[PDB]
Amino acid sequence: SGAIYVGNYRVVNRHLATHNDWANLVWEDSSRDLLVSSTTAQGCDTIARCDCQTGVYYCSSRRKHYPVSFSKPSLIFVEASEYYPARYQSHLMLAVGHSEPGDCGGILRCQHGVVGIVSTGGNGLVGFADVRDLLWLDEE
Ligand SMILES: COc1ccc(C(F)(F)F)cc1CC(=O)N1CCS[C@@H](C(N)=O)C1
Ligand SMILES: [Zn+2]
């Protein structure tokens, strides 16, 4: 689990969105595994606006933050899970790192701010849904 809290937005994995998220929906995209809902309180996260390929992510199944090198956002074939059939996921970045299904939502960050959230995994790989192209997260 986990979310990004920027401005009056909450960014979560679409497959983990709650009823309150769907009832206060701003934007969702199943091909990216992302959903954004509106919040009453202002958040403290800032979004990175860069081309970094190195950063750090939070892994809840280890209680640890790990430094990683990650690929540029791309269209990647992801195997079937409990939440999606095997399909192509867009704007996904891959790295070598530990992940388990409940690690989705952990933040990936670089020197400029939040880059994305854990969305996929398996066999020593972790995939992150990028948010750096969503420029509207920075404005009301
Ligand atoms: C954090 O992800 C995992 C991590 C490890 C493994 C394992 F291979 F060990 F079974 C499997 C996963 C699950 C997975 O890839 N999912 C979770 C459901 S939503 C799906 C997607 N965004 O298409 C991504
Ligand atoms: Zn950066």
Curated annotation (Swiss-Prot):
<comment type="function">
    <text>Cysteine protease that cleaves viral polyprotein and specific host proteins. It is responsible for the autocatalytic cleavage between the P1 and P2 regions, which is the first cleavage occurring in the polyprotein. Also cleaves the host translation initiation factor EIF4G1, in order to shut down the capped cellular mRNA translation. Inhibits the host nucleus-cytoplasm protein and RNA trafficking by cleaving host members of the nuclear pores. Counteracts stress granule formation probably by antagonizing its assembly or promoting its dissassembly.</text>
</comment>
<feature type="active site" description="For protease 2A activity">
    <location>
        <position position="104"/>
    </location>
</feature>
<feature type="active site" description="For protease 2A activity">
    <location>
        <position position="33"/>
    </location>
</feature>
<feature type="active site" description="For protease 2A activity">
    <location>
        <position position="15"/>
    </location>
</feature>
<feature type="binding site">
    <location>
        <position position="110"/>
    </location>
    <ligand>
        <name>Zn(2+) 1</name>
    </ligand>
</feature>
<protein>
    <recommendedName>
        <fullName>Protease 2A</fullName>
    </recommendedName>
</protein>
<feature type="binding site">
    <location>
        <position position="50"/>
    </location>
    <ligand>
        <name>Zn(2+) 1</name>
    </ligand>
</feature>
<comment type="subunit">
    <text>Homodimer.</text>
</comment>
<feature type="binding site">
    <location>
        <position position="112"/>
    </location>
    <ligand>
        <name>Zn(2+) 1</name>
    </ligand>
</feature>
<feature type="binding site">
    <location>
        <position position="52"/>
    </location>
    <ligand>
        <name>Zn(2+) 1</name>
    </ligand>
</feature>
